[PDB]
Amino acid sequence: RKQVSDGVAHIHASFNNTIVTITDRQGNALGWATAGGSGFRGSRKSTPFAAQVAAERCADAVKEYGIKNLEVMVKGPGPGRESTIRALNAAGFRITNITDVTPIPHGCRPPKKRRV
Amino acid sequence: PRRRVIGQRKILPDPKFGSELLAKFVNILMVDGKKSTAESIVYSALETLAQRSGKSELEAFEVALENVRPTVEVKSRRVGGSTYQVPVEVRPVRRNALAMRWIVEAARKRGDKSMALRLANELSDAAENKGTAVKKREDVHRMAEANKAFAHY
Amino acid sequence: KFCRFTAEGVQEIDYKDIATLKNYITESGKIVPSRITGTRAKYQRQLARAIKRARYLSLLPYTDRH
Amino acid sequence: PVIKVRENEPFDVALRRFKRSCEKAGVLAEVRRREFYEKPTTERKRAKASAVKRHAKKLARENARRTRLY
RNA sequence: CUUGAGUCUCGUAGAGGGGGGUAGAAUUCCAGGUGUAGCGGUGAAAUGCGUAGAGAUCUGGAGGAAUACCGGUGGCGAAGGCGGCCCCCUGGACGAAGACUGACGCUCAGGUGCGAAAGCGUGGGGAGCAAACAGGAUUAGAUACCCUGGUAGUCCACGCCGUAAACGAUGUCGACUUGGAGGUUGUGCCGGCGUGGCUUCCGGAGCUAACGCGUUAAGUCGACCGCCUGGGGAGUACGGCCGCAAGGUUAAAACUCAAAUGAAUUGACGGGGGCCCGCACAAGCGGUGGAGCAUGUGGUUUAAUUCGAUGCAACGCGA
Ligand SMILES: [Mg+2]
Ligand SMILES: [Mg+2]
Ligand SMILES: [Mg+2]
Ligand SMILES: [Mg+2]
Ligand SMILES: [Mg+2]
Ligand SMILES: [Mg+2]
Ligand SMILES: [Mg+2]
Ligand SMILES: [Mg+2]
Ligand SMILES: [Mg+2]
Ligand SMILES: [Mg+2]
Ligand SMILES: [Mg+2]
Ligand SMILES: [Mg+2]
Ligand SMILES: [Mg+2]
Ligand SMILES: [Mg+2]
Ligand SMILES: [Mg+2]
Ligand SMILES: [Mg+2]
Ligand SMILES: [Mg+2]
Ligand SMILES: [Mg+2]
Ligand SMILES: [Mg+2]
């Protein structure tokens, strides 16, 4: 119900799923959408196309706040990194800056290698 | 094949209208090499179709196809043991062939008495998006849409 | 190539010399390899000590997402 | 890898500038390298294998320059 | 006596070691805000978490463990090993100009010490990971591989263990014998020309069964030590010693076999790689498999149902 005009998009692109959260500059979420909740399960969920649909729904979820400019903070190695940023532009936002915020330990022991 | 030494085959136009698209439809509908039987079925079907829609012989047959031609289809590909249906665009020649094949097979599985009427009834519904020829186009387009995420190799 | 510390005859790379140090870190703040800048092995080690020593005093950043 | 979109800049090229900055930082490889634990015995077996294969291709290239195929 | 060995003087490089302190990133947990229906995971799922508000995002805090980049067939150490930064304590190596001692050396059974990880004891700590364990799958079965969790343990202090493919599968010391290309660290002289230490790759003679090694030798020699004597039984039993235990160490025989083995060769094969082909798939059309009959075969029956063919490549085959 409030008007912000200046939000931040957080793409969370993992190998299994993509989550798009659009927050204001203060970090309070306005809306979100995921590839899994966009009608995609399993093999579909982890595609660049499933992330594009997830981005559009998140842009459709925050339409009542009238966001005009949008910072994009991309995290993770997922296939939905690049295609989610395009869909935010296709919706009609202005991408002011794009940053990679993927957390890198400089840390803990990772899990053991899978013997598939 | 593995060599790709396949050139296109010559095909004579239809006698009554000189339509190349119509000659291919007779061949698709022909059974056992009896082309004269297939031409007489196609002609009398078109006379019923043209009179029933009032438009014409040829381009009223073109209106039947334009509602049956598919524009996207899925080809199988198995990646992790599970087979992905990968949607791929259909080139113009195959769009015509599929539509004519879908019309003939839908017409054949119909309860009319004669095939010439049976074909005309199928084409008439296809012109108005009611037949079982257009329903198979419906299915292909939604099988291709359920797989749009796989538009890659 | 062309190590600029043999060329300038440096005796220690002097972490307080932030003007020099910023030439040997990337935009995100990582030390650039001697293979890229063509620094000698001897000075590349002192350069890395000075950069880590300046990172501690907050004269230089560890990452770009602080 | 912080890309600030510049004035009168088309989106795609800024998206191209972003893809470049993340690859030069090698963050995607760094994430893929840290997802499973790598034993010290294996990291060394790889490092070595990398060096000996990096070495072999150089001499193979030096040698192939002193050759004719036909 | 001074050339081997060592001492002193000046400097250099170094993850050498021991003790203390500290920084940044990240994971996890806790508390709170925004927000809302999924998250997570997989080949695909499910277990699991989530409307008691998860996941995502922001704020504050607690905690432990490891130090991205630099980073390198780079360095240091007898070996095992050693990696953020700073200080304290400490070992060794190398180089330059001399001086000094005056062969004062090398090797070493027994002895002594050090010795990855796992493990053990006592007391702490416990984020992440993860034997055991539990569940979900997969499967014919799946005491697994995969998934979700998860305890010892991994961390610290002290003590024990004393073993590893602890490997260069190559004992230590010394001398001698064409070359090339590097790396690293000193040093003298004028980027150029020397001289040292350590180190990586290629290769000559030579050596080797061959593979290969090749001035860092597996070449030519000397000194001393360790060890071997066909395979299995067996590094096992018994005894001794050591250990809290787990076990370690030393170490047989009966019996049995006629080989076991190393290297390389030619094939064949691979759920190895590359490049090709074929109605091999794919793209299509028509069939067979269901029905009746024809015909061949098997089986059964019969006095006999003559004999033969009997994966592809026998079965309308000899006929
Ligand atoms: Mg995992
Ligand atoms: Mg001394
Ligand atoms: Mg002894
Ligand atoms: Mg231990
Ligand atoms: Mg313990
Ligand atoms: Mg205890
Ligand atoms: Mg597990
Ligand atoms: Mg070892
Ligand atoms: Mg080794
Ligand atoms: Mg041995
Ligand atoms: Mg050699
Ligand atoms: Mg024993
Ligand atoms: Mg005993
Ligand atoms: Mg086929
Ligand atoms: Mg039959
Ligand atoms: Mg026979
Ligand atoms: Mg017979
Ligand atoms: Mg045959
Ligand atoms: Mg035949």
Swiss-Prot record, chain B:
A single BP term in Gene Ontology: translation
CDD domains xrefs: uS7_Bacteria
Taxonomic lineage: Bacteria, Pseudomonadati, Pseudomonadota, Gammaproteobacteria, Enterobacterales
HAMAP family: Ribosomal_uS7_B
Known function: One of the primary rRNA binding proteins, it binds directly to 16S rRNA where it nucleates assembly of the head domain of the 30S subunit. Is located at the subunit interface close to the decoding center, where it has been shown to contact mRNA. Has been shown to contact tRNA in both the P and E sites; it probably blocks exit of the E site tRNA. Protein S7 is also a translational repressor protein; it regulates the expression of the str operon members to different degrees by binding to its mRNA.
Family, as annotated: Belongs to the universal ribosomal protein uS7 family.
Phenotype when changing residue 115 to G: Significantly decreases affinity for its own mRNA
Assembly information from the UniProt record: Part of the 30S ribosomal subunit. Contacts proteins S9 and S11. Cross-links to IF3 and the P and E site tRNAs.
Protein name: Small ribosomal subunit protein uS7
Pfam families, per database record: Ribosomal_S7
Keyword presence, Magnesium: no
Keyword Ribonucleoprotein appears in the UniProt entry: yes
Superkingdom of the organism of origin: Bacteria
One GO cellular component term: membrane
Molecular function GO terms recorded: mRNA binding; rRNA binding; structural constituent of ribosome; tRNA binding
Alphabetic keyword roster: Ribonucleoprotein, Ribosomal protein, RNA-binding, rRNA-binding, tRNA-binding
Miscellaneous: The strain K12 sequence is shown.
Natural source organism: Escherichia coli (strain K12)
Matching PANTHER family: RIBOSOMAL PROTEIN S7
